[PDB]
Design an enzyme around this catalytic site. Structure first.
Site, PDB file in Angstrom:
ATOM      1  N   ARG A  37      35.365  48.501  45.515  1.00 40.85           N
ATOM      2  CA  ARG A  37      36.020  47.299  44.599  1.00 40.85           C
ATOM      3  C   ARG A  37      35.315  47.132  43.450  1.00 40.85           C
ATOM      4  O   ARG A  37      34.270  47.701  43.193  1.00 40.85           O
ATOM      5  CB  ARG A  37      36.300  46.010  45.323  1.00 40.85           C
ATOM      6  CG  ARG A  37      37.812  45.709  46.038  1.00 40.85           C
ATOM      7  CD  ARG A  37      37.983  44.046  45.881  1.00 40.85           C
ATOM      8  NE  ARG A  37      37.964  43.555  44.884  1.00 40.85           N
ATOM      9  CZ  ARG A  37      37.691  42.415  44.363  1.00 40.85           C
ATOM     10  NH1 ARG A  37      37.152  41.515  45.092  1.00 40.85           N
ATOM     11  NH2 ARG A  37      37.704  42.186  43.027  1.00 40.85           N
ATOM     12  N   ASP A  70      31.840  40.926  50.016  1.00 44.06           N
ATOM     13  CA  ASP A  70      31.544  41.206  48.705  1.00 44.06           C
ATOM     14  C   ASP A  70      29.852  41.719  48.562  1.00 44.06           C
ATOM     15  O   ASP A  70      29.629  42.488  47.861  1.00 44.06           O
ATOM     16  CB  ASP A  70      31.376  39.993  47.771  1.00 44.06           C
ATOM     17  CG  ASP A  70      32.599  39.584  47.141  1.00 44.06           C
ATOM     18  OD1 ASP A  70      33.083  38.557  47.383  1.00 44.06           O
ATOM     19  OD2 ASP A  70      33.204  40.550  46.510  1.00 44.06           O
ATOM     20  N   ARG A  71      29.165  41.537  49.467  1.00 41.39           N
ATOM     21  CA  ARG A  71      27.681  41.906  49.257  1.00 41.39           C
ATOM     22  C   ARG A  71      26.929  42.430  50.702  1.00 41.39           C
ATOM     23  O   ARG A  71      26.964  41.487  51.364  1.00 41.39           O
ATOM     24  CB  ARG A  71      27.056  40.749  48.833  1.00 41.39           C
ATOM     25  CG  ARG A  71      27.450  40.010  47.346  1.00 41.39           C
ATOM     26  CD  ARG A  71      26.349  38.722  46.923  1.00 41.39           C
ATOM     27  NE  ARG A  71      26.744  37.738  47.895  1.00 41.39           N
ATOM     28  CZ  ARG A  71      27.758  37.173  48.031  1.00 41.39           C
ATOM     29  NH1 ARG A  71      28.782  37.008  47.197  1.00 41.39           N
ATOM     30  NH2 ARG A  71      27.800  36.164  48.825  1.00 41.39           N
ATOM     31  N   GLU A 196      31.286  33.946  33.883  1.00 37.78           N
ATOM     32  CA  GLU A 196      31.036  35.039  34.911  1.00 37.78           C
ATOM     33  C   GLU A 196      31.771  36.293  34.475  1.00 37.78           C
ATOM     34  O   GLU A 196      32.865  36.055  33.849  1.00 37.78           O
ATOM     35  CB  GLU A 196      31.541  34.690  36.351  1.00 37.78           C
ATOM     36  CG  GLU A 196      30.714  33.702  37.103  1.00 37.78           C
ATOM     37  CD  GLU A 196      31.092  33.134  38.266  1.00 37.78           C
ATOM     38  OE1 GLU A 196      32.311  33.480  38.541  1.00 37.78           O
ATOM     39  OE2 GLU A 196      30.213  32.572  38.841  1.00 37.78           O
ATOM     40  N   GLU A 197      31.016  37.489  35.030  1.00 37.88           N
ATOM     41  CA  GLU A 197      32.099  38.781  34.864  1.00 37.88           C
ATOM     42  C   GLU A 197      32.523  38.784  33.444  1.00 37.88           C
ATOM     43  O   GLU A 197      33.751  39.098  33.214  1.00 37.88           O
ATOM     44  CB  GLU A 197      33.093  38.879  35.816  1.00 37.88           C
ATOM     45  CG  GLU A 197      32.424  38.652  36.977  1.00 37.88           C
ATOM     46  CD  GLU A 197      33.336  38.095  38.214  1.00 37.88           C
ATOM     47  OE1 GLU A 197      34.707  37.649  37.946  1.00 37.88           O
ATOM     48  OE2 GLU A 197      32.984  38.366  39.392  1.00 37.88           O
ATOM     49  N   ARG A 212      34.813  34.886  32.737  1.00 37.57           N
ATOM     50  CA  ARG A 212      35.593  33.895  33.917  1.00 37.57           C
ATOM     51  C   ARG A 212      35.030  32.266  33.925  1.00 37.57           C
ATOM     52  O   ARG A 212      33.846  32.669  34.201  1.00 37.57           O
ATOM     53  CB  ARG A 212      35.820  34.715  34.992  1.00 37.57           C
ATOM     54  CG  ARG A 212      36.149  34.067  36.326  1.00 37.57           C
ATOM     55  CD  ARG A 212      35.804  34.761  37.527  1.00 37.57           C
ATOM     56  NE  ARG A 212      35.984  34.289  38.647  1.00 37.57           N
ATOM     57  CZ  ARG A 212      36.111  34.815  39.949  1.00 37.57           C
ATOM     58  NH1 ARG A 212      36.151  36.208  39.875  1.00 37.57           N
ATOM     59  NH2 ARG A 212      36.215  34.354  40.871  1.00 37.57           N
ATOM     60  N   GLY A 217      37.769  26.169  34.106  1.00 40.54           N
ATOM     61  CA  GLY A 217      38.730  26.769  33.024  1.00 40.54           C
ATOM     62  C   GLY A 217      39.652  27.609  33.383  1.00 40.54           C
ATOM     63  O   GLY A 217      39.540  28.718  34.293  1.00 40.54           O
ATOM     64  N   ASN A 266      37.733  28.746  41.018  1.00 45.35           N
ATOM     65  CA  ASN A 266      38.267  30.021  41.309  1.00 45.35           C
ATOM     66  C   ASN A 266      38.685  30.962  40.116  1.00 45.35           C
ATOM     67  O   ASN A 266      38.596  29.955  38.941  1.00 45.35           O
ATOM     68  CB  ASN A 266      39.749  29.719  42.023  1.00 45.35           C
ATOM     69  CG  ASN A 266      40.110  30.650  43.359  1.00 45.35           C
ATOM     70  OD1 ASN A 266      39.412  32.026  43.267  1.00 45.35           O
ATOM     71  ND2 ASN A 266      41.117  30.438  43.916  1.00 45.35           N
ATOM     72  N   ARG A 290      46.761  37.369  42.768  1.00 44.44           N
ATOM     73  CA  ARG A 290      46.657  38.413  41.784  1.00 44.44           C
ATOM     74  C   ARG A 290      47.648  39.412  42.053  1.00 44.44           C
ATOM     75  O   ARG A 290      47.446  40.535  42.618  1.00 44.44           O
ATOM     76  CB  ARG A 290      45.113  38.959  42.497  1.00 44.44           C
ATOM     77  CG  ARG A 290      43.937  38.156  42.069  1.00 44.44           C
ATOM     78  CD  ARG A 290      42.582  38.527  42.833  1.00 44.44           C
ATOM     79  NE  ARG A 290      41.709  37.520  42.427  1.00 44.44           N
ATOM     80  CZ  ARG A 290      40.340  37.784  42.665  1.00 44.44           C
ATOM     81  NH1 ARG A 290      39.875  38.780  43.646  1.00 44.44           N
ATOM     82  NH2 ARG A 290      39.582  36.886  42.322  1.00 44.44           N
ATOM     83  N   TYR A 324      40.680  42.376  39.211  1.00 41.01           N
ATOM     84  CA  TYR A 324      39.902  42.429  38.250  1.00 41.01           C
ATOM     85  C   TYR A 324      40.373  43.344  37.088  1.00 41.01           C
ATOM     86  O   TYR A 324      41.106  44.256  37.424  1.00 41.01           O
ATOM     87  CB  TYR A 324      38.541  42.941  38.673  1.00 41.01           C
ATOM     88  CG  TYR A 324      37.577  41.966  39.225  1.00 41.01           C
ATOM     89  CD1 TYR A 324      38.203  40.635  39.838  1.00 41.01           C
ATOM     90  CD2 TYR A 324      36.382  42.129  39.326  1.00 41.01           C
ATOM     91  CE1 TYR A 324      37.540  39.721  40.339  1.00 41.01           C
ATOM     92  CE2 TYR A 324      35.325  41.004  39.928  1.00 41.01           C
ATOM     93  CZ  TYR A 324      35.973  40.053  40.371  1.00 41.01           C
ATOM     94  OH  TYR A 324      34.996  39.009  41.036  1.00 41.01           O
TER      95      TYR A 324
HETATM   96  C1  LIG Z   1      28.256  38.774  43.015  1.00 36.99           C
HETATM   97  C2  LIG Z   1      29.790  38.756  43.665  1.00 36.99           C
HETATM   98  O1  LIG Z   1      29.761  38.636  45.166  1.00 36.99           O
HETATM   99  N1  LIG Z   1      30.767  38.645  42.912  1.00 36.99           N
HETATM  100  C3  LIG Z   1      32.088  38.355  43.094  1.00 36.99           C
HETATM  101  C4  LIG Z   1      32.884  37.263  42.374  1.00 36.99           C
HETATM  102  C5  LIG Z   1      32.122  35.896  42.573  1.00 36.99           C
HETATM  103  O2  LIG Z   1      32.226  35.546  43.997  1.00 36.99           O
HETATM  104  C6  LIG Z   1      32.879  34.866  41.755  1.00 36.99           C
HETATM  105  O3  LIG Z   1      32.731  35.318  40.364  1.00 36.99           O
HETATM  106  C7  LIG Z   1      32.215  33.618  41.752  1.00 36.99           C
HETATM  107  O4  LIG Z   1      30.890  33.412  41.315  1.00 36.99           O
HETATM  108  O5  LIG Z   1      34.292  37.363  42.819  1.00 36.99           O
HETATM  109  C8  LIG Z   1      35.127  38.347  43.282  1.00 36.99           C
HETATM  110  C9  LIG Z   1      36.350  38.297  43.443  1.00 36.99           C
HETATM  111  O6  LIG Z   1      37.165  39.165  43.671  1.00 36.99           O
HETATM  112  O7  LIG Z   1      36.938  37.044  42.944  1.00 36.99           O
HETATM  113  C10 LIG Z   1      34.171  39.583  43.329  1.00 36.99           C
HETATM  114  F1  LIG Z   1      35.031  40.755  43.441  1.00 36.99           F
HETATM  115  C11 LIG Z   1      32.893  39.802  43.108  1.00 36.99           C
HETATM  116  N2  LIG Z   1      31.984  40.929  44.063  1.00 36.99           N
HETATM  117  C12 LIG Z   1      31.186  41.400  43.811  1.00 36.99           C
HETATM  118  N3  LIG Z   1      30.717  42.370  44.536  1.00 36.99           N
HETATM  119  N4  LIG Z   1      30.720  41.590  42.448  1.00 36.99           N
HETATM  120 CA   LIG Z   2      38.979  29.640  36.389  1.00 39.47          CA
END
Ligand SMILES: CC(=O)N[C@H]1[C@H]([C@H](O)[C@H](O)CO)OC(C(=O)O)=C(F)[C@@H]1NC(=N)N
Ligand SMILES: [Ca+2]
Ligand SMILES: *[C@@H]1O[C@H](CO)[C@@H](O[C@@H]2O[C@H](CO)[C@@H](O[C@@H]3O[C@H](CO[C@H]4O[C@H](CO[C@H]5O[C@H](CO)[C@@H](O)[C@H](O)[C@@H]5O)[C@@H](O)[C@H](O[C@H]5O[C@H](CO)[C@@H](O)[C@H](O)[C@@H]5O)[C@@H]4O)[C@@H](O)[C@H](O[C@H]4O[C@H](CO)[C@@H](O)[C@H](O)[C@@H]4O[C@H]4O[C@H](CO)[C@@H](O)[C@H](O)[C@@H]4O[C@H]4O[C@H](CO)[C@@H](O)[C@H](O)[C@@H]4O)[C@@H]3O)[C@H](O)[C@H]2NC(C)=O)[C@H](O)[C@H]1NC(C)=O
Ligand SMILES: *[C@@H]1O[C@H](CO)[C@@H](O[C@@H]2O[C@H](CO)[C@@H](O[C@@H]3O[C@H](CO[C@H]4O[C@H](CO[C@H]5O[C@H](CO)[C@@H](O)[C@H](O)[C@@H]5O)[C@@H](O)[C@H](O[C@H]5O[C@H](CO)[C@@H](O)[C@H](O)[C@@H]5O)[C@@H]4O)[C@@H](O)[C@H](O[C@H]4O[C@H](CO)[C@@H](O)[C@H](O)[C@@H]4O[C@H]4O[C@H](CO)[C@@H](O)[C@H](O)[C@@H]4O[C@H]4O[C@H](CO)[C@@H](O)[C@H](O)[C@@H]4O)[C@@H]3O)[C@H](O)[C@H]2NC(C)=O)[C@H](O)[C@H]1NC(C)=O
Ligand SMILES: *[C@@H]1O[C@H](CO)[C@@H](O[C@@H]2O[C@H](CO)[C@@H](O[C@@H]3O[C@H](CO[C@H]4O[C@H](CO[C@H]5O[C@H](CO)[C@@H](O)[C@H](O)[C@@H]5O)[C@@H](O)[C@H](O[C@H]5O[C@H](CO)[C@@H](O)[C@H](O)[C@@H]5O)[C@@H]4O)[C@@H](O)[C@H](O[C@H]4O[C@H](CO)[C@@H](O)[C@H](O)[C@@H]4O[C@H]4O[C@H](CO)[C@@H](O)[C@H](O)[C@@H]4O[C@H]4O[C@H](CO)[C@@H](O)[C@H](O)[C@@H]4O)[C@@H]3O)[C@H](O)[C@H]2NC(C)=O)[C@H](O)[C@H]1NC(C)=O
Ligand SMILES: *[C@@H]1O[C@H](CO)[C@@H](O[C@@H]2O[C@H](CO)[C@@H](O[C@@H]3O[C@H](CO[C@H]4O[C@H](CO[C@H]5O[C@H](CO)[C@@H](O)[C@H](O)[C@@H]5O)[C@@H](O)[C@H](O[C@H]5O[C@H](CO)[C@@H](O)[C@H](O)[C@@H]5O)[C@@H]4O)[C@@H](O)[C@H](O[C@H]4O[C@H](CO)[C@@H](O)[C@H](O)[C@@H]4O[C@H]4O[C@H](CO)[C@@H](O)[C@H](O)[C@@H]4O[C@H]4O[C@H](CO)[C@@H](O)[C@H](O)[C@@H]4O)[C@@H]3O)[C@H](O)[C@H]2NC(C)=O)[C@H](O)[C@H]1NC(C)=O
Ligand SMILES: CC(=O)N[C@H]1[C@H]([C@H](O)[C@H](O)CO)OC(C(=O)O)=C(F)[C@@H]1NC(=N)N
Ligand SMILES: CC(=O)N[C@H]1[C@H]([C@H](O)[C@H](O)CO)OC(C(=O)O)=C(F)[C@@H]1NC(=N)N
Ligand SMILES: [Ca+2]
Ligand SMILES: [Ca+2]
Ligand SMILES: [Ca+2]
Lengths: 388, 388, 388, 388
Positions: A37, A70-71, A196-197, A212, A217, A266, A290, A324
């Site tokens: 992802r 995610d991690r 973020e991101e 983000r 926001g 979110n 999404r 994303y």
């Molecule tokens: C570090 C992290 O877990 N970021 C989330 C990120 C974070 O959870 C958010 O940005 C909130 O901090 O959210 C999402 C998502 O699909 O919404 C991800 F795809 C991201 N996954 C990733 N491995 N980078």
């Molecule tokens: Ca938002």
């Protein structure tokens, strides 16, 4: 080989043409395709490649069970040839971790991966495919970065990191790297209240990132960076065309210097190109999930709190999943201007499609045209039922 | 690296020798081979490669169901090493779409893919593996191109496109590209009344294309292009040896400037080499279906409306499936003349073999010999029953 | 890059060390490994590679059924990295056909494949990965060549072909190629009465080939070629250590100028190094079948009709299958002498192991040592029962 | 290209950052991943790669049954890209055998594989991907070498071999190679009483190896080599922090010049960095089995028989399997010091996990940081139950 410099402006964007598409979930139904992802695209001077976070298992593999998370210790930034799928046999590992960014400075590539437990993460900065610098977590709360390419100018490649709460104030820093070494860092400034991101692009010696605000926001924060002075500010896109997800309905007037309210805690990674009348915003079609993806031409979106669309282009139908989305450009193409590009992650599996035990994605990417081209839609194309 | 120039004539063609064969359906019975169709071959200065339109799934994959369809969002021009099969892991994506052409100009490669819905298709012209020019549909009816290689001369690479009805007058254009940019375009001229899928070759500063009149002709239209003047005409092959499919029985006299009647609204991509007495025509052996394939030496076929075969060579038996066929030459071989080559697409699956839910193909390719070589036949070789 | 010249002698051979082994049948039990037979090894100036005739299907694939047959339209000369298995995804096609040879002349590689029906076969000679010369069958009876590497000297690469009966007099020719073109050819001379599958090596400006007399001889014919004069003779290995298979028991005295009788119409490709006291012969351990393989040092085997072994080394136990064996050397290694090498084909499946419907092989290869090294045996290692 | 020289010291090691991880058992659950063990990492001037001993079958393949055994004819040293898994299709064979070492001298790579039966093994020394030197067994008892990279200085690459009993005195030799040729060899000197599997690194013109005393010692022998003089000594790590496995509980005082007793006839390959106060030792967390892995900073461990840890870092939890561990450095990185690195083999399957019939491993590797980074643990990550 000299460091690349951002000396051109953006080409006029009159539509978007197909650039790349890997069909990874379709093909990985019966071939050795890695679960990913958080994909993106980034160019070297002689090649552009797809990037993503692997989950360290193939999609048909039994270890794909649980990949909504995610991690883990099984993740890595991988890259692979444009429009091929990320397979076991063709994917190159850039570094290990579960949050990343990567960019080429004209001479070689810098790649950054963050790994660790939530309270003890660290970034390793690789340059020319060797580790050079490391940075420890500063707020002990999931140190994380852009998930799309960085941008360099004369060797200086700024990168946006955030450490701290996803649902409250956090500590965002801008690091300015050169050959993988830290020249300088600054804490976030300007009016953005949460970052973020960031999705970045460079033109005429300035780097613009669309980020983000996860906390408050549904308008997106924007960071504008001077890579020569090594300074920045931030604000929000003024436009009432709101581009985060989930989000409320579009108002008539947006906010330039505060989060536009209506949804808390979110969001989704997204991007824009902010260039006066030549401004295009990406967003999901749904306000709630999404699904779908469109580009809207919103003249002066950044600075005009009443701007509305003057043109548009459907990228993904509202009846198809998105995810994303992020910016990149081929800074080494010939010609008088940088051609804006972007990708959209097409997420399949959990949580929306929970008859399978996995989550993965494929990728579609477009670049701009100065023609007014006809549109198609570009869905992932896989039948979830084949995986049952 | 200089642009290549067409300075040689064709070698004397006295027979055809085997050049390449990938056995893709046989091998893909149990390995990760992509579903394709519309294949061709094209050479760079240091390598010749197989090309085709992927369907974005492997053949054993469940997504191969439905691949009889010509145009989806899951298609792309791919290339791969000569006589290997198009696999997930070795196939390189040239561009995204469901109609293509590609040629090397001596310095680098131009690749063109058309995508979109039927009423809103566009061509993207890639040069040196970056998108350079885009062209929108002009008649809103399935913008489409050669499905085999183009040819360049001193940087100028003409390409034949058609937009409009498959069963009526359509709007065919000849675009003259250089470094991916449009130097000029012209509407179709001469006596050809309908043009599709031109198969081109170059000799002595002139480019000859053999095309498909889908609307009325079972003789093939021919376009002859001067790439220096950037002009062309068209006519038909005069010969009563008719080379489209399906087709009526061969008469005694053909037509030079009109479609030879007897079959409407149907045909297949094919080719010829038109060089005075050294003229060879390809065709399916069956008048009714895409089965069998032969080469016939028909002296002066282009200009002699009574010419009949003086020699021949079976390529595929009438009890084996064929498909599209097309021309290419290795313009960078050493020696005093260009050696004519061609491929035949060997289509398997639907519609003729409908116990499987897919359609795919493999490839066989020959080049000419100045010897009189013994012939073999070259079928696809797969057992459909293994796939049941 | 200059043409290579054979300016060194053979190193002293005091034992054989392991060089390469691909384990292809073991690994191909569960991965996409092509069915092969007739393998060999050949070096370029910067790499040595495995070569074989593919059967155009994987071993687990259903199309492996029937692969005991020698000659189909689905065969091709493939090469792949040393000691890897010939997989779908890593194998490079050199040319199409069911009999081959290949060698590098110092500047580039020549590869020759013969295809066609038994009464109408032709050779295509590729040079620098393009077809250059073709040769039609002269006796209309399975035109065939070495099945192991050729050797070049100052650009001249002689090749031994045979066309005609396998069980009677046939018409053998020596072609002398340079850049893929025929400089000269000669009919077989000297006392060898039947020639097939010559295994060649070069030292001090002379090329020695050890061949198979399929018709009458259980001693092997030998052809010695002067690549500067472009002349040759032939005789047999004098030694009573007989090296074909099947064969009678070893006598006490051999024959220099005639076939040693006792077995008709059968044999196997094999090789020797004929260098005075430094002479080593390869053979199967069984007199009756292709099982086992040994090397024997037989001083002056070529010229001494009573020579017997003074040393030996087991390569494959008599309880393990062998097959074709052949010579090659790394002509681009540093040092004062050419190090003799060889491979043995380890045939699995039919006809000896007929519970499976296929025939394939793996490869083991050794080179000589000036040490007296301990020996191991090197079997194929696969369990046929896993394939049931 | 010049021979590399060891002109730098070690960087200050304040923690360990993630460098590479291949997840091979997870991914190989459903893709064509080779069974391995005895892995390591080694760098060329332009790339660092993973190395291991293949078992010549994939893990899902039926031939993986029996792969707990150390020595067969089906093994080979393979290398593959950093953090990819060792697959059939991406793995390059360096040489054939069941014990190895490999290092780059700045100009090209030397690789050494030992094969044969226990009483008749031989080493083949490859240089620039050709065999150059061979060495026969001297004690007829499983000739064996480092199983991790060697180190070179100005062309001289010493290598430690052992031949003889695993449970008694054996005959260890230090060979000094240059371009694959033997410059000199010496029998083991100093106080180490038994040597196996040395893990080496180079700094300031000296090479330090940490080895395994299989016979008596739970402290590790250390060999220090001067590659210019071509001389060495040996002793033990003095420290009471014992680093072999299995082992007794840590005492308060160690032994400098004798084996520390308590466990006989067993051990595991491991490593250390011995640099005054900057000294870090690796070990399994369990005293009884190959589980867990930690790094401990033990100032002056080599020379101080009471040194205890002043810092540490968990690499693998005690509830996860480990295995062999070894040292390497990127000698071609830019900067003022050599950054210490290591890998840990994560062994899965037999004997500890005997519901499967195979034994394999994946790899995790770290390098040092001058920051104090947060730690994670890095287990293999596969679920054995998926393989049932
Ligand atoms: C570090 C992290 O877990 N970021 C989330 C990120 C974070 O959870 C958010 O940005 C909130 O901090 O959210 C999402 C998502 O699909 O919404 C991800 F795809 C991201 N996954 C990733 N491995 N980078
Ligand atoms: Ca938002
Ligand atoms: C072949 O391909 C071509 C090329 O792709 C196809 O043609 C394309 O067709 C698409 C789709 O039809 C077009 O995209 C839409 O663009 C319009 C904008 O263009 C219109 O409006 C322009 C501006 O007008 C305003 O400006 C001033 C104000 O002072 C004044 O001039 C004017 O009166 C007005 O106030 C016009 O200039 C423009 O006209 C020109 O062009 C025409 C061609 O289309 C031509 O016919 C005309 O003659 C003229 O020359 C045109 O009127 C976008 O607005 C639209 O985007 C909105 O709508 C889609 C739904 O379709 C939605 O998803 C978008 O999100 C957005 O609507 C939401 O957001 C708005 C902003 O907040 C909000 O106002 C809306 O209520 C709506 O909000 C709701 O949904 C959202 C999203 O879910 C949610 O978040 C909210 O909360 C709320 O629920 C499309 O982008 C292309 O531009 C067009 N391209 C080209 C080059 O023509 C062609 O059709 C294909 N052909 C075939 C045969 O298939
Ligand atoms: C080993 O390999 C070699 C090398 O491949 C094999 O030898 C090859 O063998 C093949 C097959 O046998 C030959 O191909 C055929 O070639 C003939 C043409 O050659 C013949 O005709 C020549 C011209 O004669 C005419 O010219 C003038 C006219 O004024 C005058 O001279 C003459 O009398 C006549 O009017 C002759 O010159 C030539 O003779 C020479 O060569 C001979 C060697 O073969 C030698 O023996 C002679 O002594 C002499 O020196 C020879 O007679 C092709 O015509 C034929 O193609 C037609 O037939 C096949 C069916 O087999 C068909 O599929 C083709 O489509 C075509 O027939 C259709 O189309 C015609 C044109 O419209 C039409 O007239 C026909 O009625 C027919 O139409 C029907 O079917 C089609 C297709 O389905 C359909 O569309 C229609 O509607 C209708 O239903 C073959 O190509 C090779 O040339 C030959 N090669 C060489 C170098 O020799 C050898 O056999 C193998 N050996 C072994 C042991 O296996
Ligand atoms: C660790 O590794 C090492 C290195 O590999 C292992 O040591 C190796 O061990 C092998 C196997 O034991 C040896 O291979 C054999 O070599 C002998 C030849 O060497 C012997 O004979 C020499 C010559 O003697 C003759 O010369 C003159 C004549 O005037 C005179 O001197 C003499 O008396 C005699 O007439 C001797 O010089 C040599 O002695 C020296 O070396 C010794 C070391 O081994 C040492 O101990 C001595 O002190 C001395 O210094 C030695 O005696 C080969 O002949 C033999 O090959 C034959 O036998 C095998 C069966 O084992 C067979 O498969 C071969 O085909 C061949 O026998 C067939 O063919 C003959 C020729 O036609 C025929 O005569 C036979 O009847 C037989 O024919 C039958 O079978 C064939 C095949 O199926 C069939 O076609 C026929 O029709 C018929 O049915 C082996 O190659 C290595 O040389 C040796 N290497 C070294 C460097 O030492 C070591 O063992 C391993 N160690 C451990 C601990 O495992
Ligand atoms: C985020 O990440 C960070 C970075 O990784 C995490 O912080 C890390 O946390 C880890 C784990 O907690 C630490 O590793 C341990 O390090 C200690 C050593 O440091 C301690 O001791 C130092 C030296 O003290 C001695 O020196 C002199 C003597 O004259 C004197 O000063 C002193 O009083 C004493 O005698 C202290 O300097 C040091 O203090 C400093 O740092 C502190 C930070 O942690 C700070 O709080 C202090 O204020 C101060 O400034 C600290 O006290 C290691 O000793 C320990 O290793 C032992 O323990 C583990 C079990 O946990 C064991 O597995 C090891 O094997 C070892 O213990 C065995 O071996 C010993 C030697 O023989 C033996 O004595 C023991 O009995 C034990 O033996 C048993 O088990 C073994 C193994 O099974 C077996 O073989 C034996 O037979 C027997 O059964 C750990 O390595 C990191 O150093 C720390 N890193 C940093 C930079 O801080 C942080 O926690 C994470 N944060 C979050 C929020 O998660
Ligand atoms: C654009 C298109 O669909 N062309 C058809 C083409 C067109 O339908 C015809 O040329 C009529 O316009 O016909 C065939 C065929 O097998 O006959 C194909 F293979 C082609 N498929 C393709 N993806 N390029
Ligand atoms: C030569 C050998 O078998 N070494 C053993 C080695 C030796 O048996 C010991 O070093 C004792 O000599 O021990 C182990 C092990 O896991 O403990 C291995 F992994 C090694 N396997 C290998 N193929 N190199
Ligand atoms: Ca037609
Ligand atoms: Ca014989
Ligand atoms: Ca021990």
């Amino acid at each position: 080989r000299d460091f690349n410099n951002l000396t051109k402006g953006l080409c006029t964007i009159n539509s978007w043409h197909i650039y790349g598409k890997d069909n990874a979930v379709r093909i990985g139904e019966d071939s050795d395709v890695l679960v990913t992802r958080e994909p993106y695209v980034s160019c070297d001077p002689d090649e552009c490649r797809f990037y993503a976070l692997s989950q360290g298992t193939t999609i048909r593999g039994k270890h794909s069970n649980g990949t909504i998370h995610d991690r883990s210790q099984y993740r890595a930034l991988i890259s692979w040839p444009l429009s091929s799928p990320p397979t076991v046999y063709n994917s190159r590992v850039e570094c290990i971790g579960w949050s990343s960014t990567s960019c080429h400075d004209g001479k070689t590539r810098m790649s950054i991966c963050i790994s660790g437990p939530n309270n003890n993460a660290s970034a390793v900065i690789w340059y020319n495919r060797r580790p050079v610098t490391e940075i420890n977590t500063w707020a002990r709360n999931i140190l994380r970065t852009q998930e799309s390419e960085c941008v360099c100018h004369n060797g200086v490649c700024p990168v946006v990191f955030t450490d701290g709460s996803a649902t409250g104030p956090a500590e965002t820093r801008i690091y300015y790297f050169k050959e993988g070494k830290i020249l300088k860092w600054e804490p976030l400034a300007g009016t953005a209240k949460h970052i973020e991101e960031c999705s970045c692009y460079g033109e005429r010696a300035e780097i613009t990132c669309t980020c983000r605000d996860n906390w408050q926001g549904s308008n997106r924060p924007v960071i504008r960076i001077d890579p020569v002075a090594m300074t920045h500010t931030s604000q929000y896109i003024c436009s009432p065309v709101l581009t985060d997800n989930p989000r409320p309905n579009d108002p008539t007037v947006g906010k330039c210097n505060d989060p536009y309210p209506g949804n808390n805690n979110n969001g989704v990674k997204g991007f824009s190109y902010l260039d006066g009348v030549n401004t295009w915003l990406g967003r999901t079609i749904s306000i709630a999930s999404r699904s779908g993806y469109e580009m809207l031409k919103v003249p002066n979106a950044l600075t005009d709190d009443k701007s509305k669309p003057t043109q548009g282009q459907t990228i993904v139908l509202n009846t198809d999943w998105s995810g994303y989305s992020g910016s990149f450009m081929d800074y080494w193409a010939e010609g008088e201007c940088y051609r804006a590009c972007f990708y959209v992650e097409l997420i399949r599996g959990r949580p929306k499609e929970d008859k399978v035990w996995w989550t993965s994605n494929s990728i579609v990417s477009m670049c701009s045209s100065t023609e007014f081209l006809g549109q198609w839609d570009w869905p992932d194309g896989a039948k979830i039922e084949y995986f049952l």
